[PDB]
Scaffold this active site. Structure first.
Site, PDB file in Angstrom:
ATOM      1  N   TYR A   1       0.868  -1.279   0.082  1.00  0.00           N
ATOM      2  CA  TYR A   1       0.148   0.048   0.031  1.00  0.00           C
ATOM      3  C   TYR A   1       0.743   1.259   0.136  1.00  0.00           C
ATOM      4  CZ  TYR A   1      -4.195  -2.666   0.539  1.00  0.00           C
ATOM      5  OH  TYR A   1      -5.298  -3.605   0.445  1.00  0.00           O
TER       6      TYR A   1
ATOM      7  N   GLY B   1       2.668   3.690  -1.268  1.00  0.00           N
ATOM      8  CA  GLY B   1       3.221   3.876  -2.633  1.00  0.00           C
ATOM      9  C   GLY B   1       1.619   4.080  -3.390  1.00  0.00           C
TER      10      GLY B   1
ATOM     11  N   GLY C   1      -1.266   3.566  -5.420  1.00  0.00           N
ATOM     12  CA  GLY C   1      -2.104   2.396  -5.444  1.00  0.00           C
ATOM     13  C   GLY C   1      -2.040   1.522  -4.170  1.00  0.00           C
TER      14      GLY C   1
ATOM     15  N   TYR D   1      -3.670  21.924   3.475  1.00  0.00           N
ATOM     16  CA  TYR D   1      -4.001  22.191   4.843  1.00  0.00           C
ATOM     17  C   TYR D   1      -3.243  22.737   5.907  1.00  0.00           C
ATOM     18  CZ  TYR D   1      -1.294  18.105   5.652  1.00  0.00           C
ATOM     19  OH  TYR D   1      -0.134  17.224   5.545  1.00  0.00           O
TER      20      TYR D   1
ATOM     21  N   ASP E   1      -3.390  12.556   6.992  1.00  0.00           N
ATOM     22  CA  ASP E   1      -1.916  12.446   7.292  1.00  0.00           C
ATOM     23  C   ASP E   1      -1.199  12.506   8.345  1.00  0.00           C
ATOM     24  OD1 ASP E   1      -2.579  12.858   4.388  1.00  0.00           O
ATOM     25  OD2 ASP E   1      -1.336  14.734   4.104  1.00  0.00           O
TER      26      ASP E   1
HETATM   27 CA   LIG Z   1      -0.966   3.490  -1.415  1.00  0.00          CA
END
Ligand SMILES: [Ca+2]
Length: 119
Positions: A28, A30, A32, A68, A94
């Site tokens: 996960y 990176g 996609g 943000y 994040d």
């Molecule tokens: Ca990803």
């Protein structure tokens, strides 16, 4: 915004060069994501990818470009309160990921793996 996400990861992992250290990790971390997470860190990215996907259903909300307002003191990460609904939500995605990253071990073996077979 990805650049601010980078800034958040530097906040929790000061020796990190985020856009490089976590841009191709596991299934996960990176571009996609699919399959079962390979480890703890890759698990943080699966949660983060999901959050981004949800933050996408928001009226013109792109987790990728939405800038943000957040603060980074000595390690503690804070998403400012004035943020609109999208910036707030995205800053949340994040922050949680930056904190998660900092609590998970970095296993070199899981860097740049053959996603086509392992995921
Ligand atoms: Ca990803």
């Amino acid at each position: 915004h990805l650049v601010q996400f980078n800034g958040m990861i530097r906040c929790t992992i000061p020796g990190s060069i985020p856009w490089w250290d976590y841009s191709d990790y596991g299934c996960y971390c990176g571009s996609g994501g699919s399959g079962t997470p390979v480890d703890e860190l890759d698990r943080c990215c699966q949660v983060h990818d999901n959050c981004y996907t949800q933050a996408q259903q928001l009226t013109e909300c792109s987790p990728y470009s939405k800038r943000y307002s957040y603060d980074c003191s000595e390690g503690t990460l804070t998403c400012k309160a004035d943020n609109d609904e999208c910036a707030a939500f995205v800053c949340d995605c994040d922050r949680v990921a930056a904190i998660c990253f900092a609590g998970a071990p970095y296993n070199k073996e899981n860097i740049n793996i053959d996603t086509t077979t392992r995921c």
